[PDB]
Amino acid sequence: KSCPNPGEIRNGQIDVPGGILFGATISFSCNTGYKLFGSTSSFCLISGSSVQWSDPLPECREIYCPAPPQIDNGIIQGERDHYGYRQSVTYACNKGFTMIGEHSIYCTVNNDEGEWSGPPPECRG
Amino acid sequence: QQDEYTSAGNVTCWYQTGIVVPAGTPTSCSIMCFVSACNDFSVRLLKDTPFIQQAALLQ
Amino acid sequence: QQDEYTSAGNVTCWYQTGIVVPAGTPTSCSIMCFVSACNDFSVRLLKDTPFIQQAALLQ
Amino acid sequence: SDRVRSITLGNSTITTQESANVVVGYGRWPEYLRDDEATAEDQPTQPDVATCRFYTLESVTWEKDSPGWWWKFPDALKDMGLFGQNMYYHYLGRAGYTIHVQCNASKFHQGCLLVVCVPEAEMGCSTVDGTVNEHGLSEGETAKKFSATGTNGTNTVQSIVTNAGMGVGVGNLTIFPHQWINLRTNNCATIVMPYINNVPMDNMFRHHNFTLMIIPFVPLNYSSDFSTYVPITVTVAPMCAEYNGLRLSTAL
Amino acid sequence: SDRVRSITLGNSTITTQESANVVVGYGRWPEYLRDDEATAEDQPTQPDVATCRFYTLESVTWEKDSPGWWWKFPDALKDMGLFGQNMYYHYLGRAGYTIHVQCNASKFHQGCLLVVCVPEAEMGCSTVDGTVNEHGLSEGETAKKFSATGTNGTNTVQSIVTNAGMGVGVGNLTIFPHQWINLRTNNCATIVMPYINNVPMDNMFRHHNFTLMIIPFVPLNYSSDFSTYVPITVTVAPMCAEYNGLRLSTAL
Amino acid sequence: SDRVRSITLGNSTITTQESANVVVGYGRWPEYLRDDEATAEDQPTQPDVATCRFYTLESVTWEKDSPGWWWKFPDALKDMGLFGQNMYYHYLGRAGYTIHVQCNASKFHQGCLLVVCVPEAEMGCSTVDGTVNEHGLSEGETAKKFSATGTNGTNTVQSIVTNAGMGVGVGNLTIFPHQWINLRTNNCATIVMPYINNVPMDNMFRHHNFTLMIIPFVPLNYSSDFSTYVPITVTVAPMCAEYNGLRLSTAL
């Protein structure tokens, strides 16, 4: 007859276009900024006396950008670890130098991988 | 001496929203329950109690 | 669209006497801030908002 | 004190020793449909007590990082006793509600929840040029969860709390009827919502009259406070339920 | 409750949710100088709001072993906005004050402060046959500190709390207007002092009409109470300030 | 608030800032014996203040596993000032009492005590076919202790709390005048007992008019709450004491 309620994926979504009876397929996706680990779909099948899903719910996992670039003759303000999505790193130039460019860069996600946004600034003497 | 014909149902209790507590206090406690009759309560047909007995005199 | 000519000043906040707390409680918290107009407030001269736009129809 | 308060509907009663006030719709208490506002001509059924009473939904756990939760409304009570049965058997229905959100903690805990009833909370899709699912919208009792980041997936609601699934500033949800549950001062929220719609009655399966959202604005926190478990429970009671257009029951 | 309280002077307002009462001078509310009590003949200036409002002085930290603190008064407000400017430009001045000492902690902290206004608190020297300094007497805002032991040094006040810098029993300072701040019950102290002197008006630089002393009698204490920082803040508001004998400004 | 309360008898006064109510006998306040109820013909002595005042008995310690305690009554006060002296010198006596049990803890402690006055609490022996001792019955001030298990020994009271030394269900002791001390809400219990007996007066050594029992139903508990010491103190005050049949003093 019908498969049990699909449930919910933390930081994800379950699409149920065709009900949850035998033969139905449901689809999984992660929210932007999260990557899917596991299956992306499940089929409702009959196995012996049980009506059950073919595949379990996947995991949606976040992400840290790598250590920020150093700039010549400047300093990263308050450098630390674990720069997650949307966090930013700001720079200042050393005494004797003037900055040109964006003073801050942000951790973004590209293809499931954490990458720093725009180009870091330059310090000129 | 209740039977199914004169059944009265049950009472059950559930957490409506868990027990929350600050640090430094016991994480478990006790709830006590008291019973009493309301003012529309009455009883009829006197009989002996099942609860008391004896095997011989000098009781 | 305020300019210096129609400046209105600033509001700042300071500890008047620090945050004190007993043991077993978090040592840092949050304060939220709400804004609303009083009853002597009014506005004039209708214009479009800077906040919404589009590049093409089927909007 | 005025923190103390009791409410009785049908065979059910709620109590609090730490209430704020009680918010009432847009100042309007529920009422039954008047003859000069009606179109459906058949006699209504007004189950009264069998239907207008407190139903408690399954509780949720407030975690140090919970983004929030929501429930769609006439749907969500669809399996609640006779209120639900009357839904299945009638084409048209109309009701108001007393919503009572419960959450107690301790004088050593802290956190703050916004509790709002949003009329007509049409939600947006995660997949920008796709469309939602009824599943992405509601799961009956239980509750959909907001998310701390942008979501993907076809059919699911774009649920980053920050935009409340509607494309607005979450911090502006206050033009809607609501109360806050600030653990340091308060342990429950009560909102009475009147029927709000652009027609006098409507079908209760096809249209979510309003959405209840519980969004923590200041997160749960505590110390060696051997109480990490802090649940939130929603109890709601239909008020002045009336139904029209009786026929066979709707297909689940 | 009567713990709640608000006070407004000029463009400033103070509030408390945990007050005791309010102490008033020797039962006398400040008043402006009457014609049958005056000698200076020129018209006074009475700045009113520009001058009679709440000025907050720099806070101090209550440590587990703080002996106490003090402030001299008309001097101390000498750099506070127009109250101070009017001081510099006039030979004579007269004012009353609302003093509001603030100190909040937690239901798990303990300690007790005596808050007193001592009229004419002439102080003794550390060096018994020497004389004090204006510096040993007052440092304007900031605050001089009492000491737990006998002090030495020429010019400084013999400040062992025990004798309050005046050669008396500190525990007898209660014949002066005062309140106590007992952390378990109270979080502020409010004293309204009327002008007290043996002449109707006086120069505000040359004469310290009275001294405010905050002396802990039961010391601050607590446990893993991740709050070791417990500040004390003094806010005062001149009342009925009036000035006479206008001329060029005094030399700093 | 009605938590606040004061009581004065003779040269003594009791106060509480956290009382429940005050329970009064079976609704009866103590009164002196009336002429149409008397048999003993001699003039009574009514010491009044010298006798009707608060006597405090030696305190007991509430431990995490204390079963309970009890005291027999006219005996127990037999060495308390003039109340006791009047007992020794007279054949007949009559009195009522205000009983005030005190026990304070903290908002972080928990536990619940039943405080009852049982008129005519005849007790059973441990040795089923043996008889009790006066010692097994009472030790004057001090207090006998209930036990968590069945007891043995000739002469001692079968003191397993569960049957209150009387062969009944301890949880039914509530048909007797009583109050509860629930640490979270309350810090004392006050019961006023009128003279209850089947004769107008009686001998105070030979007959224990009633027994005071303090039985913890929910045990004491706490955490790193540097307060493990939680004492319970009983203070009682005879009311309307009158004595008849004066002669030489009784043999100790």
Query: Hey, where are the domains in chain E?
Result: 1-252
Is the Cβ–Cβ distance between D242 and D50 less than 8 Å? no
Q: Quote the CA–CA distance of F21 and F192 in Å, as a whole number.
A: 11
**Which helix (H) or strand (E) is E31 found in, with range?**
none
Distance CA E23, CA E186 (A): 14
Tell me which amino acid residue C41 is.
F
**Under 8 Å between Cβ of F194 and F27:** no
- The neighbours of chain A, by the rule of 3 or more Cβ pairs under 8 Å, are D
The enclosing H or E element of F136 equals helix F134-137
Report residue E50: phi and psi, to 5°: -60, -20
Tokens standing for F156? 């001692």
Contact C24 D224 (CB under 8 A): yes
- Write out the DSSP string of A28-46: EEE-TT-EEES-SEEEEEE
For residues E143 and E69, what is the distance between their CA atoms, to the nearest angstrom? 6
For residue D157, give both structure tokens: 């609601």
Residue D139 neighbours by CB under 8 Å, 6+ apart: A5, A8
Taking Cα atoms as reference points, which of F67, F87, F70 lies closest to residue F201? F87
Of D154, D159, D160, the CB nearest to A29: D154
For residues D117 and F109, give the distance between their C-alpha atoms in angstroms, rounded to a whole number: 39
Structure tokens given for E187? 């979080």
- Which chains, if any, share at least 3 CB pairs under 8 A with chain D? A, B, C
- Residue E45: partners with Cβ closer than 8 Å, 6 or more residues away: E86, E90, E242, E243, E246
The residues pairing with A52 across neighbouring beta strands, listed in sequence order, are A45
The answer to whether C22 contacts E107, with C-beta atoms less than 8 Å apart, is yes
D101, D108, D183, D221: best to mutate for the B interface, most B CBs within 10 A:
D108
Q: How many CB atoms lie under 10 A from the CB of residue D211?
A: 25
Consecutive H or E run containing D97: strand D90-102
Q: Exposed/middle/buried for E239, CB within 10 Å: 0-12, 13-18, 19+?
A: buried
- Count the alpha carbons within 13 Å of D79 in the hemisphere toward its beta carbon: 8
- Residue D110: exposure state from Cβ atoms within 10 A (0-12, 13-18, ≥19): buried
> Is the CB of residue A64 less than 8 Å from the CB of residue A15?
no
Distance CA E125, CA D163 (A): 68
For E82, list phi and psi in degrees, rounded to 5. Answer: -75, -15
d(CA E97, CA E236): 7
CA dist., res. E34 & res. E27, Å (int): 19
Give the residue among E208, E179, E227, E184 at the shortest CA–CA distance from E93. E208
Token representation of residue D86:
């009357």
Amino acid letter for position D25:
G
> How many CB atoms are located within 10 Å of the residue F101 CB?
20
Residue type, E85: Q
- B27 contacts in chain D (CB < 8 Å): 226-227
Residues of C with Cβ-Cβ distance to B24 under 8 angstroms? 23-24
Q: For B20, which residue in chain D has the nearest alpha carbon?
A: D105
Do F218 and F112 contact (CB within 8 A), yes or no? yes
C32 interfacial to chain D (CB closer than 8 Å): yes
Which of C25, C29, C30 minimises the CB distance to D223? C25
Angle formed at CA D218 by CA D214 and CA D222, multiple of 5 degrees: 110
Method: cryo-EM
CB A62 within 8 A of CB A37: no
Which residue type is seen at E197? N
Looking from the CA of D203 toward its CB, the CA atoms found within 13 Å total: 8
| E36 CB burial (10 A radius; 0-12, 13-18, 19+) | exposed
DSSP symbol at E250: P
Q: Is D124 on the interface with A (CB under 8 A)?
A: no
Q: Which two tokens stand for residue D113?
A: 């929840």
**What is the strand order of the sheet A12-15 is part of?**
A12-15, A25-30, A41-47, A50-53
Phi-psi region of E233 (alpha: psi -120 to 50; beta: other; left: phi over 0): beta
Does the CB of B31 have a partner CB in chain D at under 8 Å?
Answer: no
Give the integer Cα–Cα distance in Å for B56 and B59. Answer: 6
Residues 6+ apart with CB under 8 A from F104: F18, F187, F188
Please name the residue that has the structure tokens 């102490």.
E23
State whether residue D171 is helix, strand or coil.
helix
Structure tokens given for F244: 């008849």
Distance CA E60, CA E68 (A): 10
Residue whose structure tokens are 């699409």? A15
Q: What is the C-alpha radius of gyration for chain C, rounded to an integer number of angstroms?
A: 21
In the 8-state DSSP scheme, what is residue D34? P
Contact status, residue F214 vs residue F189, Cβ threshold 8 Å: no
Instruction: State which residue of chain C sits closest to B25, comparing Cα positions.
Output: C24
CA dihedral E22, E28, E31, E35 (to 10 degrees): 180
> CB–CB of E225 and C26 under 8 A?
no
* Residue A124 CA: distances (Å) to CA of A69, A92, E10, E55: 17, 12, 53, 47
**F237 with F77: CB under 8 angstroms?**
no
| SS3 state at D43 | coil
Give F80-130 as a 3 state SS string: CHHHHHHHHHEEEEEEEEEEEEECCCCCCCEEEEEEEEEECCCCCECCCCC
Cβ distance D184 to D20 under 8 Å?
no
Q: Which CATH class is domain F1-252?
A: mainly beta
Angle at F213 between CA F229 and CA F80, to 5 degrees: 85
Cα D243 to Cα D245: distance, rounded to the nearest angstrom: 7
Cα E10 from Cα E49, distance rounded (Å)? 4
> Resolution limit in angstroms?
16.0
Question: Is-contact E237 E98, C-beta < 8 A?
Answer: yes
Element (H or E) spanning E136, and its range?
helix E134-137
Are A64 and A84 contacting, i.e. CB atoms less than 8 angstroms apart? yes
Give dist(CA F127, CA A91) in Å, integer: 88
Among E43, E120, E113, smallest CA distance to E74 is for E120
Whether residue F24 lies within 8 A of chain B, CB to CB, comes out as no
Considering only the beta carbons, identify the residue of A6, A13, A28 that sits closest to D126. A13
Q: For strand A41-47 and strand A50-53, is the pairing parallel, antiparallel, or unpaired?
A: antiparallel
